[PDB]
Design a protein around this ligand. Structure first.
Ligand SMILES: [Mg+2]
Ligand SMILES: [Mg+2]
Ligand SMILES: [Mg+2]
Ligand SMILES: [Mg+2]
Ligand SMILES: [Mg+2]
Ligand SMILES: [Mg+2]
Ligand SMILES: [Mg+2]
Ligand SMILES: [Mg+2]
Ligand SMILES: [Mg+2]
Ligand SMILES: [Mg+2]
Lengths: 126, 241, 111, 178, 144
RNA sequence: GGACGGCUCAGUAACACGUCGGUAACCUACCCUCGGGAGGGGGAUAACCCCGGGAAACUGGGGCUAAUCCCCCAUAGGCCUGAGGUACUGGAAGGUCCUCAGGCCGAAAGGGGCUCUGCCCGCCCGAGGAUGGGCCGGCGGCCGAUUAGGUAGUUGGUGGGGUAACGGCCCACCAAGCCGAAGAUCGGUACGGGCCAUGAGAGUGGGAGCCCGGAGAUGGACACUGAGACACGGGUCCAGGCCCUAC
RNA sequence: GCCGCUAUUAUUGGGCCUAAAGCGUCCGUAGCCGGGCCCGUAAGUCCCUGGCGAAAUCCCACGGCUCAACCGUGGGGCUUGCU
RNA sequence: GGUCGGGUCGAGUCUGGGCUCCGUGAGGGGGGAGAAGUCGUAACAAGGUAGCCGUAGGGGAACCUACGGCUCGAUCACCUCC
């Protein structure tokens, strides 16, 4: 989805007729589907408003996992339990609220790999 | 539409410039700089209109590029440079110094002064960051920044004033915002008015705090704390009007 | 317990969403008013009504003008239809919601 | 939606009132006016004075006192009222007083012109000075302080006392009502 | 009785009723619905140009006896035929067919007909870029 | 640098405009202040030279060369997450700062000129400001009931994605909300205002010209580059029309 | 063509037996109007004060172009106001 | 950069269904003026059948008839209020 402006409907239900064309600054971008890769972690770089930078991850491998202030790079295996979508656990797609099977076990993501380009996760105690 | 403004029409200009709004179409658009547009005027207007050392902008630009006008001890060669409240405009070749201060009408004027006071600039502190190195950055109303340490971080507070020796930038005479402090207003209705502080009210949310001030003739008036500029402890000590 | 900028009593229980000013990370800024709740159907969403009088220069008279606002209602403050709530402005929470309930004076009875 | 410079004279509500016509015909012959426009201009001057005076009667202080003082000192300066005057006296004033403060009329007086029509020609051809300044506008309202400084121009043949028309004008030294 | 809403908090209904009966005002209605603009062949103009189709004459109402001269005129901006009265004494002879003619309003009370001419709303003013008054008084002979 | 200025008022009954406020939910080249840094390598290619092609528009191949051009490496720095400390400001901390962890992204021109051992104009990073914008909200300003029900991502929520940034902006899954006779929806007309005309005033009317804002650049749709454009004197396609042509 | 004329849109400030005009009559929902005293609140309302409502435009004085128009200095007002 | 595809914002192009809009325009309807005309004489005086409302039917046409109402009806004969 491209245009992230206003909606064409009032809360009343009435129609809006756009008084202006769509500006470059109110667009979006095709989403990152941070899937699990076999290897060669894949990422792209986005030039953004202001000349700023976003790192968009497309294939993640490692998933820095955290417990109580201690981290380690622990080699993602797969995805389980995405509350955002079930098609995501099928396609093995990572997001912020996802659960990932890993070395050292299950971990709940805390990062936005489409934005920050890294997968950071938290060990679930069981 | 598609971007920023590089022009200014002389009618759409600030209300505090002494500009002769209908004589021409255009005015100098000030550069971004120390102060704001609401508390500044460009050096071209100072050199050409106020002091009258030039009838023309070409002459004024020649002067400024020769380097005959200082603003707080520094040569300023740009004609769009903002000159703001409590700023010292010096001409050594003529031995003159002026303090840019506001009028009671609300407009900016040049108050003549001498060298001693001309090496002084009072700065309202206006904010206080904690910066890397665990150092304290005072963020001052001329958009300036001064670094101090966690030892006197408490001697330095936001609405206070700092006298500054400007071609070197050495703090002298911190003046705190307290009761009895001599104050000079800078904006509002009670603009070029001065006196001693009496009271401060807080007003819960983002509503600005307000100060009650007592003039020399005993009258008693309110304004905003942000518009209350401290110039002294009991006497203005900076030769205001 | 935190002390959001307008002095009024916080709730008793402390468990909420992040869109609560006291127990979450939501902030409030700008304007605040008291109003009456007229709907409490939506989850964490009420409708608050003001009633100001508008002067007509010509006819030298006044007319009522109702204004709804569509505030957020955290479960700690489960304001119901009738209650005189205090509401404050914040960031957008939804298409229509840019306000949040902070405090109540309950009303079991109305007129 | 901009300024649009407006006339400084008001025309009458009806163009063909016999009373107004007679009155204005008399005034125009007495004061030697080219235009009803000119007359109405001075009438409008008066009207504005009167309206200000009215408002300031029915006004309150700290402003509308300033304007009272300003009105009275303006009219003093113009020579329409004495210094001990009041808004009541404003309302007593007349268009004839205004027209008497015209330059054409003061030059018909000050024994300078012998006729208001010749006064007009003197002014327009450049033979009258007011405070050293040539004025060519006969409708110029003279200030009570400039009145005693009215004189022929230095670069005027009428300033030579040997001039024939100067000799006639001073053969008839007259003034008073004009 | 005492009129409608006189209360301090009745401005709404008061405004409403005044609007309701402004619509009984016919001037307001014409202005606001733009009826003249919809039914005007001159399309909201003070003048218009037309081609003379024919020269005719019209009988004065009842008491007056005369044949007022006129012309049927085809207007260019819309192609519409209107009849226009030719003031003057030999104006209809100074005017010829296929001639371009300028078309004013005749005056008349509601932008309408004038005097003993029952149903004529328009005047001729210029004929082939020459004023009919001058043609009639002899001066400024006609081009074509 | 060309995104300003300049032009026009089609569209738009809308947070477009006015005004009060907010952004602790965001971007900002030029400018100011402060604090720091400028290390080590490498490369290409115009101009020029040889030859051209093509009706033009335009354009090819080979040779040669530089840079404040381009690339790389490291160091600084930036972003995310987790833990805890509570030094800062604020009305209030998902903020700043301190310590530690795991990571990803990752600068720079010590260039040029002089009276050259110093000065001037400059490069990069960070903190703030300023400037200019984005977005949110309260209030406010036409007609029609011979337009009465409207809305289906529609109202909200949970979780996300995306965005500079909040947001049903978009998505998946949950619910049934939202607007409305104080007139919704639909239709009509209309750039908004400051202002202007008129009138004793109350009021009625207008909102081309100057300023402020907005929108648009044959109609429609989409992108590149850049701090900033979906770009009046830049790009691409469709529709429609026109011009040159060696068709 | 707009305002005025027009108290022919009427809040100020119009009329409805016979001139245009009282629903055929009643009942009642919203709305509007609402008896008297006491207490409270202080939402409207009033006062005072802080911050805003750009400049130009409007009024006034004073100055400069011969006066004026125009321009500048200053005072006031204007913006429906909002806070 | 091409060529294959797979996704997207997507104008447009063909078409079928509705809904209005516009330019026209046969043929029927009434309306308004005017001209003198044609048939009558409905109405105003008790207008020569008093007039008018409502409903219904009928009639070249104004109109007529019926049922209920009104006086915005004249006259003379009663009682009453004045
Ligand atoms: Mg590197
Ligand atoms: Mg339009
Ligand atoms: Mg064109
Ligand atoms: Mg009427
Ligand atoms: Mg009447
Ligand atoms: Mg103003
Ligand atoms: Mg009959
Ligand atoms: Mg009969
Ligand atoms: Mg009969
Ligand atoms: Mg029968």
């Amino acid at each position: 989805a491209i245009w992230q402006g206003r909606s064409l409907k009032k809360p009343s239900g009435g129609r809006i007729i756009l008084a202006r064309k769509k500006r470059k600054r109110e667009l979006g971008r095709e989403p990152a589907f941070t899937r699990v890769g076999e290897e060669k972690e894949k990422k792209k770089i986005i030039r953004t408003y202001g000349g700023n930078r976003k790192v968009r991850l497309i294939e993640a491998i490692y998933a820095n996992v955290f417990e109580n202030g201690k981290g380690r790079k622990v080699k993602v295996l797969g995805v389980v339990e995405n509350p955002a979508n079930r098609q995501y656990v099928r396609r093995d797609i990572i997001t912020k609220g996802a659960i990932i099977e890993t070395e050292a076990g299950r971990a709940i993501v805390t990062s936005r790999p489409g934005q920050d380009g890294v997968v950071n996760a938290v060990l679930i105690k069981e | 539409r598609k971007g920023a403004k590089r022009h200014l029409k002389r009618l759409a200009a600030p209300d505090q410039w002494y500009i002769s709004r209908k004589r021409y179409k255009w005015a100098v658009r000030p550069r971004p700089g120390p102060h704001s547009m609401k508390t500044s005027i460009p050096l071209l207007y100072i050199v050409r209109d106020y002091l009258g050392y030039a009838k023309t902008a070409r002459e004024a630009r020649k002067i400024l590029n020769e380097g005959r006008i200082l603003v707080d001890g520094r040569v300023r060669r740009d004609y769009k440079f903002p000159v703001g409240i409590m700023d010292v405009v010096s001409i050594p070749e003529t031995g003159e110094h002026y303090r840019v201060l506001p009028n009671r009408i609300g407009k900016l004027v040049l108050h003549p002064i001498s060298e001693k006071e001309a090496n002084i600039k009072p700065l309202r502190i206006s904010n206080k960051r904690m910066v890397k190195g665990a150092k304290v950055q005072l963020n001052l109303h001329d958009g300036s920044n001064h670094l101090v340490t966690v030892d006197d971080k408490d001697n330095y507070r936001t609405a206070y004033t700092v006298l500054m020796k400007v071609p070197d930038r050495e703090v002298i005479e911190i003046l705190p915002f307290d009761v009895g402090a001599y104050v000079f207003v800078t904006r509002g209705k009670n603009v070029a008015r001065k006196g001693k502080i009496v009271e401060v009210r807080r007003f819960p949310m983002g509503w600005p705090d307000v100060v009650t001030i007592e003039d020399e003739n005993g009258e008693l008036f309110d304004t905003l704390k942000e518009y209350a500029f401290v110039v002294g402890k009991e006497k203005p000590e900076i030769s205001l009007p | 317990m935190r002390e959001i900028g307008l002095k009024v009593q916080p709730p008793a229980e402390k468990c909420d969403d992040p869109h609560c000013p006291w127990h979450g990370h939501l902030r409030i800024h700008g304007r605040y008013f008291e109003g009456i709740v007229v709907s409490d159907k939506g989850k964490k969403t009420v409708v608050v009504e003001r009633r100001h009088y508008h002067y007509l220069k010509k006819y030298e008279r006044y007319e009522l003008r109702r204004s709804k606002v569509h505030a957020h209602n955290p479960e700690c403050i489960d304001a119901k239809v009738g209650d005189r709530v205090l509401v404050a402005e914040t960031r957008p929470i939804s298409k229509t919601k840019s306000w949040v309930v902070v405090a109540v004076t309950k009303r079991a009875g109305e007129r | 939606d901009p300024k649009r410079q407006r006339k400084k004279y008001e025309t009458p509500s009806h163009p063909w009132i016999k009373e107004r016509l007679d009155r204005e015909r008399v005034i125009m012959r007495k004061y030697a006016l080219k235009n009803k426009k000119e007359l109405w201009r001075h009438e409008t001057q008066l009207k504005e004075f009167r309206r200000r005076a009215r408002r300031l009667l029915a006004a309150r202080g700290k402003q509308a006192e300033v304007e009272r003082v300003q009105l009275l000192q303006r009219l003093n300066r113009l020579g329409l009222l004495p210094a001990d005057a009041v808004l009541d006296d404003v309302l007593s004033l007349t268009v004839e007083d205004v027209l008497d403060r015209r330059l054409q009329t003061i030059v018909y007086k000050k024994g300078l012109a012998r006729t208001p029509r010749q006064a007009r020609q003197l002014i327009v051809h450049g033979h009258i000075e007011v405070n050293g300044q040539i004025i060519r506008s006969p409708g110029y309202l003279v200030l009570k302080a400039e009145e005693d400084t009215i004189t022929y121009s230095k670069t005027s043949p009428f300033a030579r006392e040997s001039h024939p028309e100067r000799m006639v004008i001073e053969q008839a030294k007259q003034g008073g009502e004009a | 009785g005492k009129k409608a809403p006189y209360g301090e908090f009745a401005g709404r209904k008061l405004k409403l009723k005044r609007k309701k009966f402004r619509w009984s005002d016919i001037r307001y209605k014409r202005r606001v619905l733009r009826l003249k603009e919809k039914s005007d062949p001159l399309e909201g103009a003070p003048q218009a140009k037309g081609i003379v189709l024919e020269k005719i004459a019209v009988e004065a109402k009842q008491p007056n006896s005369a044949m007022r001269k006129a012309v049927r005129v085809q207007l260019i901006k819309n192609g519409k035929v209107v009849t226009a009265f030719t003031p003057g004494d030999g104006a209809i002879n100074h005017i010829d067919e296929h001639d371009e003619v300028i078309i004013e309003g005749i005056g008349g009370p509601k932008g309408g007909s004038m005097g003993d001419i029952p149903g004529i709303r328009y005047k001729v003013v210029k004929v082939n870029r020459v004023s009919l008054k001058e043609l009639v008084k002899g001066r400024k002979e006609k081009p074509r």
